[PDB]
């Protein structure tokens, strides 16, 4: 549930509807461009103190990597 | 008396300007201090989560 | 769901005395205190997912790890 709320700031987009007349690549590129301002890392990189860049990178790494992405511990307990 | 009044007003103006200038630099220093504290606090909390993980 | 048993085999908990103070320190006014107690009285007779998720939020990750290790030690002793 926590990771679901971080999708907009991590360029994590869903599968948008595609009908006859347009291809997936064009629609995805347009949708990514629309939400480009929400993405955080390049916005800090283009302007911002190096300390801010490092903190943002570390925070992004911690948020994206979690224990439901292919990790369990019941086996270890057994 | 006119000379005294002009001198007194001149002294007041320079003192007021100096006090305002001193206060402004103090506020600027404080704001810079706050940013450094926030960065340190952010650095500490990410360090703690890494140890917990 | 977890529910209480019958004929308990242990009565040695001897919990600490409840703290008592003015109504303001706990849930504002006296009238508000009764409403909240009644609302949360439904959770007293069972333990389930709602309790576990709150524990996870409060304990973070350090609490989970220490609890798991202690439970393993308890199992080892038994």
UniProtKB/Swiss-Prot annotation, chain A:
Spell out the subcellular localization from the entry. Answer: Cytoplasm; Cytoplasm, Perinuclear region; Cell projection, Lamellipodium; Cell projection, Ruffle
Q: Which domain of life is it from?
A: Eukaryota
What else is noted? Answer: Breakpoint hotspot for the Prader-Willi/Angelman syndromes and may be implicated in autism. Commonly altered in tumors.
What does this protein do, in the record's words?
A: Component of the CYFIP1-EIF4E-FMR1 complex which binds to the mRNA cap and mediates translational repression. In the CYFIP1-EIF4E-FMR1 complex this subunit is an adapter between EIF4E and FMR1. Promotes the translation repression activity of FMR1 in brain probably by mediating its association with EIF4E and mRNA. Regulates formation of membrane ruffles and lamellipodia. Plays a role in axon outgrowth. Binds to F-actin but not to RNA. Part of the WAVE complex that regulates actin filament reorganization via its interaction with the Arp2/3 complex.
How is this protein organized at the quaternary level?
Component of the WAVE1 complex composed of ABI2, CYFIP1 or CYFIP2, BRK1, NCKAP1 and WASF1/WAVE1. Within the complex, a heterodimer containing NCKAP1 and CYFIP1 interacts with a heterotrimer formed by WAVE1, ABI2 and BRK1. Component of the CYFIP1-EIF4E-FMR1 complex which is composed of CYFIP, EIF4E and FMR1. Interacts with FMR1 but does not bind to related proteins FXR1 or FXR2. Interaction with EIF4E stimulates FMR1 binding. Component of the WAVE2 complex composed of ABI1, CYFIP1/SRA1, NCKAP1/NAP1 (NCKAP1l/HEM1 in hematopoietic cells) and WASF2/WAVE2.
Q: Indicate the family of this protein.
A: Belongs to the CYFIP family.
The protein's name is Cytoplasmic FMR1-interacting protein 1
Phylogenetic classification of the source organism:
Eukaryota, Metazoa, Chordata, Craniata, Vertebrata
Q: Which residues of the full protein are shown?
A: 1020 to 1097 of 1253
Swiss-Prot record, chain C:
Q: Where in the cell is it found?
A: Cytoplasm; Cytoplasm, Perinuclear region; Cell projection, Lamellipodium; Cell projection, Ruffle
Q: Can you tell which superkingdom this protein's organism belongs to?
A: Eukaryota
Subunit details: Component of the WAVE1 complex composed of ABI2, CYFIP1 or CYFIP2, BRK1, NCKAP1 and WASF1/WAVE1. Within the complex, a heterodimer containing NCKAP1 and CYFIP1 interacts with a heterotrimer formed by WAVE1, ABI2 and BRK1. Component of the CYFIP1-EIF4E-FMR1 complex which is composed of CYFIP, EIF4E and FMR1. Interacts with FMR1 but does not bind to related proteins FXR1 or FXR2. Interaction with EIF4E stimulates FMR1 binding. Component of the WAVE2 complex composed of ABI1, CYFIP1/SRA1, NCKAP1/NAP1 (NCKAP1l/HEM1 in hematopoietic cells) and WASF2/WAVE2.
Name the job this protein performs: Component of the CYFIP1-EIF4E-FMR1 complex which binds to the mRNA cap and mediates translational repression. In the CYFIP1-EIF4E-FMR1 complex this subunit is an adapter between EIF4E and FMR1. Promotes the translation repression activity of FMR1 in brain probably by mediating its association with EIF4E and mRNA. Regulates formation of membrane ruffles and lamellipodia. Plays a role in axon outgrowth. Binds to F-actin but not to RNA. Part of the WAVE complex that regulates actin filament reorganization via its interaction with the Arp2/3 complex.
Family according to the record: Belongs to the CYFIP family.
Look up the further comments and give them: Breakpoint hotspot for the Prader-Willi/Angelman syndromes and may be implicated in autism. Commonly altered in tumors.
Its protein name is Cytoplasmic FMR1-interacting protein 1
Q: Which organism is it from?
A: Homo sapiens (Human)
Which stretch of the full sequence is covered here? 863 to 940 of 1253
């Amino acid at each position: 549930c926590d990771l679901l709320h971080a999708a907009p700031f991590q360029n994590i987009l869903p599968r948008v509807h595609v009908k006859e007349g347009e291809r997936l690549d064009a629609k995805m590129k347009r949708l990514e461009s629309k939400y480009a301002p929400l993405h955080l890392v390049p916005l800090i990189e283009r302007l911002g103190t190096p300390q801010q860049i490092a903190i943002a990178r570390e925070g992004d790494l911690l948020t994206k990597e979690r224990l439901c992405c292919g990790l369990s511990m019941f086996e270890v307990i057994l | 008396t006119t000379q005294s009044l002009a001198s007194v007003a001149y002294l007041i103006n320079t003192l007021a300007n100096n006090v305002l200038q001193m206060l402004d630099i103090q506020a600027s220093q404080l704001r810079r201090m706050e940013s450094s504290i926030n960065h340190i606090s952010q650095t500490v909390d990410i360090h703690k989560e890494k140890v917990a993980r | 769901r977890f529910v209480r048993t019958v004929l308990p085999f242990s009565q040695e908990f001897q919990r600490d005395k409840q703290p008592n103070a003015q109504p303001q320190y706990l849930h504002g006014s006296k009238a508000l205190n009764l409403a909240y107690s009644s609302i949360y009285g439904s959770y007293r007779n069972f333990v389930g997912p709602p309790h576990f998720q709150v524990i996870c939020r409060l304990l973070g990750y350090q609490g989970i790890a220490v609890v798991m290790e202690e439970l393993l030690k308890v199992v080892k002793s038994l």
